[PDB]
Design a protein that fits this description.
The structure is cut from a larger assembly and holds 2 copies of chain A. By secondary structure, chain A is largely without helices or strands. Chain A has no helices and 2 strands. A two-stranded antiparallel sheet of chain A has the order 1-2.
Chain lengths: ~50, ~50
């Protein structure tokens, strides 16, 4: 907005502009410690071993 | 005027959970909000503020 006294209301003054994630639904830790990872799955037919 | 009402009046909206996405310390109830959902009858349809 641009209030009557002509100041400025910008996001900073209403929204805490951070930088988090898409979801806060998956929380993972390795050995009780904070971590991420990827559940790499085997495509049909291909060799697990390869 | 009729069309553009059977739209608004009969639709399916969104509304997050209660916790889920990042909550506050020590919260306890997470539930799911259920806002506007489609009419299901000639009754409910008969009544539309035009």
């Amino acid at each position: 907005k641009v209030n009557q006294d002509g100041s400025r209301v910008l996001l900073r003054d209403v929204a805490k502009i951070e930088l988090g994630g898409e979801n806060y639904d998956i929380i993972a830790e390795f050995n009780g410690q904070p971590a991420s990872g990827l559940g790499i799955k085997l495509a049909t037919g291909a060799n697990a071993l390869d | 005027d009729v069309i553009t009402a059977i739209k608004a009046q009969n639709a399916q909206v969104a509304a997050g959970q209660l916790g889920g996405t990042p909550p506050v310390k020590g919260q306890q109830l997470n539930a799911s909000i259920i806002a506007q959902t489609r009419l299901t009858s000639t009754e409910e349809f008969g009544k539309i503020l035009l």
